[model samples]
Target chain A: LVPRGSHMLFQNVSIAGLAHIDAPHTLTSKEINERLQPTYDRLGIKTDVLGDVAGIHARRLWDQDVQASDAATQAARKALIDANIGIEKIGLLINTSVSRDYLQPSTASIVSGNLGVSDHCMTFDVANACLAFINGMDIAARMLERGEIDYALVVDGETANLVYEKTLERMTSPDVTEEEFRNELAALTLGCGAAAMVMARSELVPDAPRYKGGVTRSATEWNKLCRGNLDRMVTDTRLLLIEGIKLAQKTFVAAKQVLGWAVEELDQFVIHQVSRPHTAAFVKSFGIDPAKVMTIFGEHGNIGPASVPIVLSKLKELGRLKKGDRIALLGIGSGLNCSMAEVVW
Target chain B: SHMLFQNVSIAGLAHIDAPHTLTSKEINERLQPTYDRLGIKTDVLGDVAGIHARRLWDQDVQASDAATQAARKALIDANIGIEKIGLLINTSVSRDYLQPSTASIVSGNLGVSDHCMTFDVANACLAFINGMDIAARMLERGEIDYALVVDGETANLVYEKTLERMTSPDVTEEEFRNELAALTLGCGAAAMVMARSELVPDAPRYKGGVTRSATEWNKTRLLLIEGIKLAQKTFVAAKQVLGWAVEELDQFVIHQVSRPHTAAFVKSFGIDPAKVMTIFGEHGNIGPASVPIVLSKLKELGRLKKGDRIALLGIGSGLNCSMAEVVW
Candidate 1:
């Protein structure tokens, strides 16, 4: 028996081009620990958690004056070059970044202005934490499937500079509590990066990778597990690990029903990286091959919403993907939201 | 022709008025000292902006709380339970956190099932239309039976902060003028339950429309002139796609920014001023919640009739303009 809306799977949507920009400044975990050693001694902390437990050797950061829109625009330019397409060809532009310039006008509009897109282009911003890029892709796919627009641009730019700056200051404060320090530990694992994709109708880019839309499962009761803003993030890492795995398992069951998902059949898994333990827990729980998943979290850290596409773009850059390779785009975002989608290269 | 959404209907709609009222008279009184100090004489809130009063929620209320309240009322209006909703999209300018989307919090409050998908759309005032259009696509494709689009705007913080800053002894003339717009904002919540047309045969049909963006004008200084220009372009597309005739639309539910902006847009388009219903004067620009709140008020007032052609229009902060039609 076929699942409802199985025929609605996008046949015309394709990833025409994809690109990711690595932030230039690398801040090593050891350096960060060095800065915090005095506070660590004051707080009676015994271990170097970020470097030892999180396995985050370093994370990237942008310059002080750089904004989310600027990074996204740079990525958009590169992605357009990769696609061999002009700016005017894009009919839709959606920015799906957790870090935004302002609460209004949309980061997408600023990027569109920077790129000088045509008057025909429609723009907006999607905010769903780490899974927003996938949501943007699905939203663009709907318009593309309906032939309303030929090509769409999905972009994400994330900056953790301010978060890092403020988080470190707060962590190193003399009066800092152990509970507060532990809750804010996850904030330091975040890195700065940007990624953009030029998705088009399959008829236009016939050789492009196919984006088969996937299934989502939410346990919104866990919404408060991780809360963040531009300068701060508070997380319950233990609960996030347990509940996130549960939600991902539920999403995978739905994925199997909808996308006929099998761990061995998928050639690559582009999973969102939170930490070394989270990755290990997820892979071991699903019995997914460690070799199949390429991780950048050790060096680049977590790039929030841009992580998935950045990983996919890096995989492409490394020439790890082959034509007709089945790739699984998996993420468990902070909303206790889990999404598992497929891409055929 | 394929751009127009098919098989989508407005199942239900509702708006929540924040309980506390903050009148322009009261605000002007509070700012009189600062105005005199800054050598400013104009009552920008009431006379200049044409806004008399607006509402504010209790201090404890977050965007998610207000949205969940509106969602409950919308579900009641639609005569459907939370389980029937397959998608929940929050289009609020105000949000609870950067992670665990506001939509998810609202969904959790409503006790939605595991099958429901949730996310937030942020496009200033135009996001409600975007959310509706997004839902229309899923409905047209028979992927989902019902979707809930919720927007709850909280300008309380903006109002509080702007007022405090403007009242400072060192405030500048330019600073006071620039921050005057914040005084005209109010808190409100709106939600809509949209379903496949076949599921709600008697419900109003939503024919999704067209959009055009002038991102270069994404600034405050040229908003009036650039916004109207963008709307003119978007209306042309609507004319072609929805066969829109300014004279044919019975009701125009437009997003309200200020009295002057709305008047300029109405004058430029030659749209019948009488055909439009506005709440901006008293409600004071609820951001993305404005369009649906006006539509909900129209329904509650029994102003709409069966077979009436309604046009929803807005020029958002992206300097983005969208025009869509609903056959009631």
Candidate 2:
């Protein structure tokens, strides 16, 4: 139904504020060592999966017992600042977080209350693994272009404290095998955070950055590679990175056609960074300029879906992005999902 | 096709207000004279069913207008230029008209970028969830960075007409009892903004869970009760594909249909009734917007915390039930 290159989805939308929860790394380390004391004494499972193996020393979480909505609200406020508008002015709110407040009355509604939006607003959540936020942005942009809404808010919040705590416990166990440890350690790298974007009609925001639409690919076959589980989460290491990256490469070719994406032409490449190597390999594969892309994975750890927006928000904070700068948002996820889009910052 | 996500994240959230205190009692009182005129002796509407009252928008409100209003708030929440949005999909059962794709009108009113994609999805109650999965796939594979999923339900019209039809001379108590479910219909609208994960780190990842359907009973239209029967199959699918063990989930956000229907689902799945939350009694049934509205309420009240496991379950008139899980 859609041509490959033409971005008919988000010529009108813009990004707002993106935030992340900071799960304490120090406590994580202490807990792991303590839990592993017995294991180390018994099974000699002494490998340092976090610091030595994966090169992760810390992660972040909200100090105030934050939920996804709490983080989403903070980011939404910043997004409102980015849009320079009042909450009452927004006509719609779409919370695309995979983490919801309940099985009903989406987290978006609570965010609306926290933001004190007008009574006229509409809200809901879109869950598609890690791709939901993009779906919401593209959907809202079309509505704005069609005169259905003057403005829209896209918000998401993620917390990884539970994964960290539980994974640390499992990884520290003496009976933990290298394979099991690899999967558990991945959880330890998770960071808590939230992100938001304010999109509006270009006419109302002529000078605002433009969000170019993108595409997707789903390899349901590998959907089980990385999954949430009881006691502790699990991952099939050899498959997720190796196979996941391969899928991303194929998707990128289509992105090139749809976005006419020229690595040389792109001013910046801000992608979801699960790890340092994932970033390097993706950039090298595309021949993208490393200098143009800034990373926070080392300091912030993997903040789930908040990776790209947090970078964008940082760019906005530092005033690094100039009007008309070409920026690319790209990444792949465990649903075997992959996506890419262009933006005029 | 195997692909990679470029950019996207959730921008905002909101809900159409369902004012408290509008019980069916007051509504029935106003219609009592009409009931008497039609020789309706039994309290077939209220006695047989638990629905007391439902909410309606102000007389002047239109579905498109409500949808547009929601779109604006969503735009503000996202903090982006609306013109950058590339696609819009409307998923709602109640509307002012069918043609022009309510999406088109929404786009036109928003004054969006001219080069935008727009369409409507009709999947009974599951339309919004379907839209989410569809739009998310596109966003994930780099097809689009941002997309909007919007739904506005105005069940007021149905209530108005049902009351009129039920009071007719030919109507019987059995006939009237069948129409009682219609009384549960409420008015509301809900919208969502979906994007690729890279755009917003730590944003909850909306997994492409799983779904199952049963169309063998096309005769479901004749027997509305079969609708519940159809949902049973979907629940099984949810359990198998979504990796959901009803008790494992922290919250059960099933669609607010009726108390009995909700109870039946929890009972069948062996799910803890406590985990299953509801807003039907107070807000009535708001069609597609019902699911999102309840979820949003949980967030405000602080019951749903980070890392909380929740489920979205619903049974639509198409005799469809789709349930998905999310970790907060």
Candidate 3:
């Protein structure tokens, strides 16, 4: 008999294709520091916080006019090409982004329109900070497992240019305070990028990587640890670091039970990159091997929900994934929520 | 072998009405000078839109707060506790922040256990149905014993800001007309508790149905014309999947937009007007929370009976149309 009240592990879902786009414009920490040196001097802060302390040398940005839907659409087109399928083959499209075009129509719809999806296609947006890409994957997986759709698209496009513009302006103001500047510092770490995945039933793509849905644990009591909008983000970075790891620790326990997760056994750990310290703390706490993790935070900064898929795509592009290699996908989003899922390549 | 859901049931549901009522007359009174300056003679909201009054929450109530209140009531209605919930999805367009999900805030307020998963699904006005279908997938697969789908829409900021902008001396006729829809919006919340059919043997069965999209119309002014066209196609799929027939469906609980859109949808589909219940005239459009609130009101009014067939359908802002069924 099946276990009572246990989460169902997806059996028929597979990653048919995946791709990521690096925004064309690179905004380096050095350039930003030059603009903030005056403020730093007045405040008597001598640390190279964004560069040396945060370990983020640079982040990418889109042109001022590029909307979230535009970036996501471009990524989706490339992902469909990677999958060797046409737009008509996709039955569902979900946009998991922190950046959006309008408050009314979903960004997914805009991307779908650009791609000319069939009338039978279903589209929506999922918002859960950085973990939404995983959530979208699971949502699509259920339908794939049930054989409801032949294929689905999970897409994310993060545009941090506006946030960076406003943040830098505020931080360099004459009346800027130490506390406010520190709180707004995380905004600079955000980068613009897009990632999309084509998911299908395993039977449809026999050679594709299998998606085995994993577990999620929440510490909503820390929901206020990080709050953001299109133009601003205020965070208690210290509390976020502590509470986030605690949530991940609990999530790992559940992952062990659900996905049979063993840090030593996994070939690759495709983790969401926040900063050097947060990633280091997570790996140390879980005893995960440093060599197994592929990080892009050093050059690309944090790309919100698109980070995991982009990293996974990068791993694949680098030809590092072997057949049947177990890959662990992990992230702790702003809800103080941690999710750990598995992909067998 | 069909795509329709089998084992998912709506165990309990509730709706929370905002405390204050802001009428169109009051709004018009405030905008009278702007309208006169712009040479607009029509009372667009009350006369043209047929929206006389809409509800508003206190200035302090956030979307998460409203959702939390509705969630508590929904749990009580389901005869369950917070610890029993394994999943929580918030489907509101109005959110507290862009980082932490509004669902998490509501979950934190409700004191849900760490076992509960949380997220927000946004698809404009149709998100509540999207939330239900998502939860149903888990319930049908026995992934969780119980799930909560909640939506709390707050239009306080929009109303406050829109009114302030429209009354400005620099406001133009086109700007005022474009912002007219903002005034039709109201604040409210609704939540539903779902479980496996086996767990709630006597509860209503939710047979998730079909969806269709006309994404080309995502940016729209001809919403009525295009929305009805999309709904017609969705109904065709629903006919094949749920065997949906207008006369057979006992109650039509639709997402309220405006009186014209609702009337057009009902007329185009040949649906009996008496079979439909609408709150747009007084409550206006509550964004994603509209459908569930209307359904909850139907239940509270004792309009439903055992073995009744209820059709929940809507055309969301994504130019997406979904039609689903519930057996009471």
Candidate 4:
């Protein structure tokens, strides 16, 4: 049974380290404009969809090709160092991303081996569209509260390297539509990036940034806004953003109940890098303090589910989060799922 | 060893089996020369793995597609509809991508409501029953009236890769032997609708079973081999905690991993081979779908009469072992 008023307990888990990797290929808005100038003139798409409604300029892509595992491992090393610990101390590793490294042997397992973690480490992957990192944090918190292991690692590396490649191919097609053109704008935000964080139990650090549990609210009726296979992907952006925000509203109500989530009490809000409007609309509805929230969407673009950790890792590097500061992670995934959790930094 | 809230019941149930058939003989011919070179003279498909054939999809059939097909049939079998389902879970291993879980895709396909919660439970073979037990707790607590359990497996990748590699003579003997086990995989799908007993009169009740794991020496590369030890521990739990008497069970359904794995589990548990069913010989190891597919097959074959006690067991890749009981 849970202890009475147990919600106030300090999360003794420490956030060891965090890091981000931009793909070698940096596409500036001008370059993108140059490539699209002719097509924009031909199609007469004058309103800059990339910057207007979506509020995105440009994002990175791998010059060659980078697998999710490779990018995740890079972030894992930095996290290990930041934690002041070695990979051997980690007992579990979870890959929470919208992309995968392979069909089998979970990409998390590959990350574990690459990090040279302890042989006893338990590894797996969790995908709930953009809400995955929040899910991962909650799962890791339970293990931490149970005193299962001294340390755990949650890593995410989203790749949209082929997004531009495929989006260009689709846009180049003579049969494409203006609506399809608007949908393809999201593909432009599919930035290639990776991030990782190390979470340690109280035994390792009497005082460290720890994860608390979260609340989830879902509306599966809208699960089709975005989807992908190996080769191609398609989405209904307007419907997705609008529907996703509605799901977020329902979830935040539940979050407020469990998290005591008065904006005044919370110091930071780390939401998935969905879009400027998606974040703005959610924050506006809740009257949340937008300053606490980091907006990497402009530069990093949509890194799928990895956006949460990527932002958190970036925040950690900036050293802006005080030890006792409370952080909120909110996201709406394609499952039409919404998850909001509290983290102590 | 915690006692579950109450005895769980299968207030509703459902299933689906694909039409494609892939014979083991056809698979073996592709590797016949290697078998000959290894001095393995037996008809390995039938004698070794107890598999005659398995199924492979003709095209890239998504896991969500298979899950949805079975889920619809299961709803029909249970006389329930999409509105009745509060939870839908995907237990299949052959997934399309990481985001928007296969379960979400299934929920989309079924036209489920927004309040319907869903996620994919992936523990290799034990996922189906794992979903069942998780839903059991919710049902017992009256949290949700119904939860749908689903799985859809596609062994296309395994066949395509195995066939390509076997043709190469440079592969080591050890690698060749390990590759043979991968061939034991098959493609198929199954789904079961579970719910609170108060919602359905005269419905079959599922007495949730037990689980024990041994992942200490987990063979990440070769998952099934080391998983047997975990299966043994699970049986011990079933016997000691759930009072599972192999002799008392009407039917035994174990994950179809291979002939040796199946044989060893039966002998270790002291189960009668006659009571145990064999689809591995034909169906191959359909990951976690092995248990439910066999359950559906038993039901179709008229093997279990009403009130018959049955055991569904499996050893999965996370090196997980799980089994549950059903009152037919």
Greater-TM-score candidate between 2 and 3: 3
Off by over 4 Å in 2: A1-9, A16-47, A173-179, A229-231, B1-256, B259-328
Query: Model 4 Cα displacement at B7 (Å)?
Result: 7.3
lDDT (tens digit, per residue) of candidate 3 on B58-98: 97899999999999999999999999999999999998887
lDDT of 4 by residue, B56-131 (tens): 7768788888888888888888887798888787877887665578998888888887667777755566768867
TM-score of chain A of each: 0.98, 0.88, 0.98, 0.92
DockQ of each: 0.82, 0.03, 0.86, 0.28
Per-residue C-alpha lDDT of model 2 across residues B98-193, encoded as one tens digit per residue: 223456567667765534556555556676776776676567546567788887777666777888887676767666656766777788777777
Model 1 B-chain TM? 0.98
Candidate 1 chain B, poorest ten consecutive residues by summed lDDT: B215-224
The positional error of residue B81 in candidate 3, measured at the CA in angstroms, is 1.2
**Rank list by DockQ:** 3, 1, 4, 2
TM-score of each: 0.98, 0.55, 0.98, 0.78
Report clash pairs, candidate 1: A324-A345, B307-B328
Per-residue error for B119 in candidate 3, Å, reads 0.4
Model 1: how far residue B77 lies from native, Å: 0.4
Q: Give Cα-based local distance difference scores for all models.
A: 0.92, 0.66, 0.92, 0.74
Tell me how far the alpha carbon of residue B294 in candidate 3 is from the true structure, in angstroms, after superposition. Answer: 0.6
Candidate 3 docking band: high
